[PDB]
Subunit: 237 residues, 6 copies
Amino acid sequence: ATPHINAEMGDFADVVLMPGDPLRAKYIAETFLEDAREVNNVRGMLGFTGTYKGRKISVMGHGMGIPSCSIYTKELITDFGVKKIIRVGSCGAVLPHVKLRDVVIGMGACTDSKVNRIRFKDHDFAAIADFDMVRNAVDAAKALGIDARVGNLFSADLFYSPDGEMFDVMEKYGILGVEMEAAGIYGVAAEFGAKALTICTVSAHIRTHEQTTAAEAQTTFNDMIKIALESVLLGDK
Amino acid sequence: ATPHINAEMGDFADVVLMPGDPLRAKYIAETFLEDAREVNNVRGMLGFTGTYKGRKISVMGHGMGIPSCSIYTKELITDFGVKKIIRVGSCGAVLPHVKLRDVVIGMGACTDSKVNRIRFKDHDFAAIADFDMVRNAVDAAKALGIDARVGNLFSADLFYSPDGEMFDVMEKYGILGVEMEAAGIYGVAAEFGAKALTICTVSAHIRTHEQTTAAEAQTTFNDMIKIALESVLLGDK
Amino acid sequence: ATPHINAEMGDFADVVLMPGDPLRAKYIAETFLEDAREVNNVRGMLGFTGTYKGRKISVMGHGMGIPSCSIYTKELITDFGVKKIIRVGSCGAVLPHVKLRDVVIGMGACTDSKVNRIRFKDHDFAAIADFDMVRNAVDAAKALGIDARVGNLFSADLFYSPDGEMFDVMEKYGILGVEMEAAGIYGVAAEFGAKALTICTVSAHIRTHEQTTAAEAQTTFNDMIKIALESVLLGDK
Amino acid sequence: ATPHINAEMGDFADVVLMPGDPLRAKYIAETFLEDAREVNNVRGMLGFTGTYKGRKISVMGHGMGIPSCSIYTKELITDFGVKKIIRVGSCGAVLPHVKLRDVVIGMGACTDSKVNRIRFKDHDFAAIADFDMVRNAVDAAKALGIDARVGNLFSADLFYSPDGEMFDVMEKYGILGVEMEAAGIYGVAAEFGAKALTICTVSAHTTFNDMIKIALESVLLGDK
Amino acid sequence: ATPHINAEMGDFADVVLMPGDPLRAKYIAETFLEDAREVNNVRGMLGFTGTYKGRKISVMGHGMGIPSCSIYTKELITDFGVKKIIRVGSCGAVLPHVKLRDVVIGMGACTDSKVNRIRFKDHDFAAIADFDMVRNAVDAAKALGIDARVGNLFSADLFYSPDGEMFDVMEKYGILGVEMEAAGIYGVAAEFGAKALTICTVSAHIRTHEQTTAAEAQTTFNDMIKIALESVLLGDK
Amino acid sequence: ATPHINAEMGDFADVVLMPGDPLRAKYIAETFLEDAREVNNVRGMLGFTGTYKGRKISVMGHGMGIPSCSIYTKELITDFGVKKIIRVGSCGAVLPHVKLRDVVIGMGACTDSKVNRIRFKDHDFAAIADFDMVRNAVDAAKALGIDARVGNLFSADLFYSPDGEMFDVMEKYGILGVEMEAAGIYGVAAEFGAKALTICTVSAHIRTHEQTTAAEAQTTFNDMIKIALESVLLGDK
Ligand SMILES: Nc1ncnc2c([C@@H]3O[C@H](CO)[C@@H](O)[C@H]3O)n[nH]c12
Ligand SMILES: Nc1ncnc2c([C@@H]3O[C@H](CO)[C@@H](O)[C@H]3O)n[nH]c12
Ligand SMILES: Nc1ncnc2c([C@@H]3O[C@H](CO)[C@@H](O)[C@H]3O)n[nH]c12
Ligand SMILES: Nc1ncnc2c([C@@H]3O[C@H](CO)[C@@H](O)[C@H]3O)n[nH]c12
């Protein structure tokens, strides 16, 4: 019923978890949700709806990059009644003791994209998460006994940057993770009046060159998923 | 001492409340702090240190504008061991449900200043507060029975803007209050590795034209001060 | 292998056709390639290698947006020996005489992305195709009796743009189609020293609602694939 | 009254000298003016009015940075009938043959602020002083046996630069001094149809009293 | 007549060759055109019209820099019925394997000018040549036994640049030649609805600081003019 | 000789007057200079040297636009010992009260060119004249009973600008005349350590104003040149 999602109103829950990888979305649905049913396959960007401890929850890929996730998050918000989006992604670390598989929560997201300047008359829009969603994730992580650091992400347009110097700048300003979506989703949420949060798992260290495998990112970043799901239940009250 | 502060290490607490108005700092010191003493008067930018419920706390003006407060925040952090800065300011509102004297908490701060682009290689730095400090303010406000919205501020360089239409864009994107400092303080905090939070009292409504007096701003915005002070105690645990 | 491609040197031909939709990649492999073998499925971004009239050819999706396709095209070039990339996508028209099903070839690509400014010290980089590839496509098109316009595409970051006025500007400057990838692929081609071409078919007329049948669309899609495939054989000499 | 100035029309002369430091405004008032009276104290930004050689003159601090002085200069111009603003400040010098107690007059003011780009559709606005005021200041200095240097200032947003990249660039293109207000004041003057001048004493690489005399005497030359 | 051209409709052919130096336009007229007559001398910017192999052809200087050539090209288009402009110039090489005397055809033109951003709402306009004119020039060069390079020029505002590093950037993204006009002409052609092409001969290597001799300069210049003229004939078919 | 001036050290005086039109330089030489002779004709950019009231003076065209005049002024300063450049041109007025044939002295020059941002690390360089030169010109005019207007010029890159509304902004900020060179000449003067001034006579009113223009002055084109020449004699004292 939308140009990139073959589904109808009601097919999605009012909260959607979104990794960039549709195969991770499939894994999450098969592993964490009961009675999961596929609700989208357009362009292979798989989305599912099921229950978690009785709560109706959806999970769907958003693809890589600001332009990709801006399409899907917009369509979910304006045409599927989605009120909350929780991005559950991977990121690269620049800080010395942020390590592989650490969970980080993006209360804010820097970017080298032009999308928000386009929205905001070429000034600086502070791309931020919903505060209550941030707090729910923090509280859920505490209850699960999982460490999670809250701060700034950097949403990059170029995974392969010609400007390695920017990584030193990011590190100097305390950037917790480099990914490619948070700032765009946060812009969409502000534009169309919904609520968003990005939680990432560290899948690479940009300095040490340590990194997980594609298979590991697809199916073993479960801490962030437990946090995301439990945080929804806290949100419901 | 530093070029704009004639004091020595120890004269300031590790937390400093900062309004733009040094006369407001003085009122706060005389009204909320016991055994208050003047620790700065360079350029008339009054700063005081005293105790609040046994806790050593400072309050000092930072002047109007990003370049003004950038100077004071830098100097406090590098030379006076300051770890937390709570800006306690005034702001104008654009949103139709935001009222005069409402308290707003700036989890993020947008800006039309160039200073963060200067820091961040001409990219978008998301100028954000420290998460724990935001939560401390929210919890303290709740305990006090004082309402407070958490969200984005906009830090303007021009109080008298030629671009009146930018207010519609701010309103569209949910900006809670227009002030002149938060994004600057947040960038300095990130640069020099400290923590910061801006809490503001709505002193004018840009749509309804309602406005408090200069006298009222100087001495009567006490809800935000109570919140800030109690938030520090929560932060100490 | 790379983080985004689970294959090794040799799995890909030195020419790769890329639609945005990985399911179209599978379609192309099944319909126009002989002895097609799937060589990638990381993140569900299907890629296949086979032969067309004896010539080894690969086809793989690139996802939506400049950041997505920039990852895949970079990795193909630096790690898989890929010499030529031909994007085969869809676009929206703004010109009155450009009709649904028309084939456009992007000799250049305008953009509102910041990726090329990041590469090019904030100056104007003209994102352009390889001339021989453009010529090969024009000649292949002629031999199949298919008309094609050659000129500028516009690669947009925001499918749902808040700036409707920009479409008038694109029309005024002769933009043939609006898509979301070409300028990004062309920047990668220049950065890493390879050759690229984007060919699109018009699937929408922006400022209407007009569409064709799923049949007219498939036939037209097929026409583009044939132009792309025949253009490669011409390039081989 | 305005949100930042507790006074009424007539409380200010039509010319206002403005140092950054309000305590320096007080000093100027007490030292050079007859019958000096405090006319503003909102936010502690002290302003005074009195007479210099029979001529009504006001002096008021403008605070540090473009945003601060933009508020005060605008309000003076639009709400208190002020026609001329003379900033009297300090600056740091980058040029070798520009000396450690020299008086420089900013005929132009560079900046890394975005405020004039906001005013001028993201093009380059040459932030300039009023020419007659520059002339009056040069002649006033000359009559006092001071050769003031006239040229470009640089108005910085960041007193504490993250990288200091601009210092060599300022030296290369002949900037006479570095301060934090001129480009802002000149933008306000252009936007609201008034006249402005910034005069600075090179504080780093009296003197102070000399600069003030120059400013005041330049007003009297302007009156003729 | 127009403010910088004292001539009337008909005085120019529908195609105009344009060197920067008006004295070179005079040489071209005298050397290559039959029955050449001078049709402009305003500001000393000599223009001539005559025939080449029976075909009416004009040649006129455009002066140095984007602002200068933008004036002349605009006026020819809106008031003299000119359809095609061929800039014929010299350029400096940055690439090690681009040699003195090489012929470069600018299918695209990069620039550090702001003129196209002014036209294109501060986004990236890809300043491109007309495709048929590019192909006509390649084919004409081939028939003359010359292999021209086709790619990007860079059009600089500053002949004497203070930013030496930009040349490294140009070299990195494969710029074929540096001159001062192409991007401006391409911008005018798109704005006013005409066709343009820039052909240059490399007369300098920016790194080696080598410089073509006068004898080879005259030779390769003549080759460039032959290519331009014969390309017009090819285009007429 | 320099790449654009076929002359030797000594052929030029240490002060050079520059109109845009080389034929105008010719006119100035013949009308005002004694024993004038041609010192350059490269690209038809005529330069002459002679005496005015015993004072050795030169006059040479600079062509149209910032990039053209930037080339000539640089070379004169670095290779011909030129100390002062006085541009003598025409300009268009945007203020209704400015008169036809009024003389405008550009103490400053705004621009939409990027050349000074390239020099000044993307910040705002105030392109200004030499103060003594400005005063000399003011005094010279006054002596001849002409009240010259002293303030900002605007140096445009596009004589045919697509942004008519920018002229409203110029009027609002008090711009006295629109031309195409001053800001560039001032940038070169500061870059290479020389002194410059632009003097213009108003030759048109730009755009239609409700008001009605003041009137028209009795001042002549020759009057402007005299002011320029006389201003040099004052400078000599
Ligand atoms: N070191 C890194 N840099 C940038 N992005 C990523 C990611 C995420 O994975 C994708 C790119 O691999 C994209 O969606 C991004 O958000 N993981 N590790 C990353
Ligand atoms: N409506 C409004 N707009 C902008 N700033 C302010 C303020 C704050 O007060 C000062 C200007 O009045 C400055 O510090 C700014 O942050 N109060 N009301 C405001
Ligand atoms: N009218 C339009 N605008 C933008 N993109 C597209 C496309 C292509 O389809 C995808 C988005 O639907 C993306 O890859 C884009 O290049 N088809 N029609 C389009
Ligand atoms: N070397 C220097 N750099 C920046 N600002 C200043 C000043 C002025 O002093 C204040 C900062 O101390 C501010 O008003 C600025 O304009 N004096 N010397 C300076």
